[PDB]
Motif scaffolding. Structure first.
Motif, mmCIF file in Angstrom:
data_model
loop_
_atom_site.group_PDB
_atom_site.id
_atom_site.type_symbol
_atom_site.label_atom_id
_atom_site.label_comp_id
_atom_site.label_asym_id
_atom_site.label_seq_id
_atom_site.Cartn_x
_atom_site.Cartn_y
_atom_site.Cartn_z
ATOM 1 N N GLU B 146 0.803 -1.215 0.000
ATOM 2 C CA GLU B 146 0.000 0.000 0.000
ATOM 3 C C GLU B 146 0.847 1.282 0.000
ATOM 4 O OE1 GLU B 146 -3.691 1.898 2.639
ATOM 5 O OE2 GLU B 146 -2.480 0.265 3.474
ATOM 6 N N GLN B 147 1.943 1.281 0.757
ATOM 7 C CA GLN B 147 2.704 2.545 0.784
ATOM 8 C C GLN B 147 3.956 2.582 -0.106
ATOM 9 O OE1 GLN B 147 0.496 4.499 1.399
ATOM 10 N NE2 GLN B 147 1.852 6.075 0.548
ATOM 11 N N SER B 288 8.535 -1.092 6.102
ATOM 12 C CA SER B 288 8.443 -0.132 5.018
ATOM 13 C C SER B 288 8.745 1.231 5.580
ATOM 14 C CB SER B 288 7.026 -0.114 4.439
ATOM 15 O OG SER B 288 6.766 -1.327 3.777
ATOM 16 N N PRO B 290 9.363 5.370 5.349
ATOM 17 C CA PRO B 290 8.530 6.288 4.547
ATOM 18 C C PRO B 290 9.186 7.024 3.350
ATOM 19 C CG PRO B 290 8.983 7.239 6.719
ATOM 20 C CD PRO B 290 9.535 5.843 6.735
#
Ligand SMILES: [Mg+2]
Ligand SMILES: [Mg+2]
Lengths: 495, 499
Positions: B146-147, B288, B290
């Motif tokens: 998702e990110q 993950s 940023p």
């Protein structure tokens, strides 16, 4: 059938067979080493529990059930055998069992139901008729100090005035045809009661129930105050009272459905050398220790009696699955009763009850305005200060993005979060549990030195922040898509 | 004939897929699925449940015939076959485990290479897009997490470059993010072989000719990650690995040689002067972070593919995924070579997948340990220096030293040793001066500025083991019963009634 299994060992065993969690071993096995070896492998492969029907040179009709609360290889059902001890279904996991235990511990007991007779009386041997060596008593590990008759069951004693009946879990080594030996801790309830008989100049009347109702064995290990009888808490655990009959020779009350009951007395001053033996920490230390004689005056048993056995050692075995789980459940009560932001505690079976993992509610952590060192200290005082937490030397503190009941996730957090310079908090002033196997000569003289809090909360978590998202199915995808993937799992083509 | 198929699986990705299906280790997904997140999410769950690898047949808005294979070296839930899918990357059978694979890899590193077999044609050439025809977005290019900062075309393959004089062909594992229809971006570290070659072309004022092989022969991919000296071509080591050479064909536009069986080959060049933001992305450590980083553009001039092309994908993150199962395993094997070549009393090394390659467990031969007449602090420092100073050991921040009564490839036994042996006052040996691997997720700002601070040796050798003694026996099947009886139990297991 599931609640029936909890109140009746024989039914428990049939139930296992029905659900495919029992292997009937009809070929001939030796109670000398072979039964233990097989049963040990069963724990480690997480196989079905074995029921040995043909045991060399043993009482005809007699049987042995290995690994009564071992785990199963099938991960969806891995805790089912354990769960039956608490009247819980096949898919029950650590969190379900912990919630049930916590509730039970708040529930009302139910007075035992006294009966005139029951299956445990189907066969009775008195005095001279007593010969323990006729049962298939195993030599469990190669280097044990003797054969073990009792490794899955409990002791029954009572105060001289009859006001307090005490069940406690214990083990008995075979000494001869009518004598056993095993530990009685002076400060434990059994030792306290034994003192009351001693001041009257009397040995302590005793019985041991083997192949007891699974929930009665559970009840026997429940954390209860002095003066409170364990029998009633079978009703607390499963909403139904245990059924009891009077012994043949000493006026004690034992569960009616038990497979084998030994009756007699704990000697005032006679002892034998007991051990060495496998213990909960996975080790067999080589030195024997003098322990009191338990004289057997009588024994009773069901027809075709089943002697259940535990082969203590490297996890997971009953020490971990029953007693570890109970400790986990108590530690969560301790933590929450203290107001700690903890939503789960788990004494990983893999760590042999030498560590507890505390799942930290990260959504409430920032409000404490603390940091790792202070939080470790606070948790150390609270947990190690408790009766249950006394038993566990190492605590791991970790955010609840992981599931602390899954060791692979704990390992991941441990490896990737615990900073070697900042997250290792030793507490050498805090008194140890003396059985912790890594203790050295100085710790043992000092009485402390072994306690540790390992912090896996990143510093930013104390401000409600987190440096990086967890790249897992649970945390790397939006709620809707997770749901879609789970609901469509079958459609995709998975079993 | 399973062994026929095992051998072919190593040299042909398409056959590998058929092999899995026949073993019941593939799920054919005909349900329509979305490259946007759904394929990644399913594949992620597959790693975590250790389910069969999914071959997706029906992907929204994708090139006709295009397929995706998730979890190409994920683990299986069946404990006796858990490493079968991984094992096929090394020409090995279904019951092979960690130790069997380490042994094969160590023997491979000292075997002779076999020069690739040059072919005039192969199935990778069945479809060819040139120039203006290249449109990377027609493939089922996944947004994996998702990110993520972008979709990734390449999460399961290797780069091919070559020195200007043609004397050295270099394969190396890497990822590539999609930038547009004919452009990608990903890391090209200057000190590694791809970056050294890139610098050679830079010196001529030239971009670097490049291809990427996706759905390459599984043992080609394995060969591509091997620790070979500078100037040595990975391609020959398919032969060292499986005893037969890889088969190669020339690219359509730039003179490079790529495996003939590859599903999808991208061809182009690595830009001298252009960057784009690549990432963020899930990484091997399970996290993950940023913020992405600038990386060089890889311009695609052409590509070719097999009919019904299968794009394999890796959804990096919490273990076990391919970073752990392929590269962690190779690291374990190299650390074992490092330990032994240094004469440490070590009979196995294992970078537990569960620790996301953030620790290495060293199995200690306790009788050889006694001969050294040492102690915990001195042995820790010696192992720290030797291991952390190596190329492979540089990657792993934490070491666990433990007696070989346990199997260090079983995390449950490692956990047991760790809980019952590591004394809180005496066995935590931090090495704050030893240079860190900067990706280690727990490093703080002070560590990063300084370049060190995160290294640790955890000692699980009790003091008496240094004199060759042990305070207590291990109460396990292996150690609590004599050899012949264990053998009887094993041999009679089915006779007892176990199935
Ligand atoms: Mg009590
Ligand atoms: Mg190279």
């Amino acid at each position: 059938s599931m609640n029936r299994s909890a109140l009746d060992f024989r039914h428990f065993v049939d139930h296992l067979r029905r659900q495919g969690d029992l292997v009937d071993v009809h070929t001939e096995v030796d109670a000398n080493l072979e039964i233990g070896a097989i049963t040990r492998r069963v724990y480690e492969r997480r196989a079905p529990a074995p029921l040995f029907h043909n045991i060399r040179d043993s009482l005809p009709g007699a049987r042995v059930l290995g690994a009564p609360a071992g785990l199963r290889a099938d991960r969806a059902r891995a805790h089912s055998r354990l769960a039956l001890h608490f009247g819980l279904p096949e898919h029950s996991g650590p969190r379900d069992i912990v919630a049930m235990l916590r509730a039970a511990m708040r529930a009302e007991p139910i007075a035992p139901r006294r009966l005139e007779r029951g299956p445990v009386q189907e066969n009775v041997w008195l005095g001279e008729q007593v010969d323990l060596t006729r049962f298939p008593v195993p030599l469990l590990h190669e280097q044990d100090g003797g054969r073990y008759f009792g490794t899955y069951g409990f002791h029954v004693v009572q105060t001289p005035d009859g006001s307090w009946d005490s069940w406690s879990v214990g083990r008995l080594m075979l000494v001869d045809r009518n004598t056993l030996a095993g530990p009685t801790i002076p400060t434990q309830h059994i030792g306290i009661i034994r003192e009351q008989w001693r001041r009257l100049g009397k040995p302590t009347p005793w019985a041991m129930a083997l192949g007891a109702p699974p929930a009665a064995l559970a009840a026997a290990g429940m954390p209860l105050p002095e003066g409170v009888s364990e029998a009633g808490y079978v009703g607390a655990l499963v909403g139904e009272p245990v059924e009891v009959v009077r012994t043949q020779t000493n006026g004690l009350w034992v569960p009616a459905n038990t497979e084998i009951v030994l009756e007699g007395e704990i000697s005032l001053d006679e002892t034998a050398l007991e051990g060495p033996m496998g213990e909960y920490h996975g080790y067999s230390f080589p030195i024997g220790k003098p322990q009191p004689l338990f004289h057997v005056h009588a024994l009773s048993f069901r027809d075709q009696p089943i002697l259940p056995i535990c082969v203590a050692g490297t996890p997971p075995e009953e020490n971990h699955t029953i007693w570890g789980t109970m400790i986990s459940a108590q530690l969560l009560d301790v933590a929450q009763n203290a107001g700690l932001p903890v939503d789960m505690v788990w004494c990983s079976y893999e760590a042999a009850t030498c560590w507890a993992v505390l799942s930290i509610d990260v959504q409430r952590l920032a409000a404490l305005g603390t940091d790792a060192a202070a939080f470790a200290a606070r948790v150390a005082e609270t947990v190690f200060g408790s009766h249950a937490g006394h038993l566990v030397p190492k605590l791991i503190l970790v955010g609840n993005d992981i599931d602390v009941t899954e060791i692979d996730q704990v390992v991941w957090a441990l490896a990737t979060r615990a900073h070697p310079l900042h997250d290792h908090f030793a507490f050498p002033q805090i008194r140890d549990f003396p059985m912790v196997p890594y203790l050295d000569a100085e710790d043992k003289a000092r009485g402390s030195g072994g306690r540790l809090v390992i912090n896996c909360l990143y510093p930013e978590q104390f401000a409600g922040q987190m440096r990086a998202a967890t790249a897992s199915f649970r945390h790397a995808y939006p709620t809707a898509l997770r749901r879609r993937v789970e609901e469509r799992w079958s459609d995709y083509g998975f079993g």
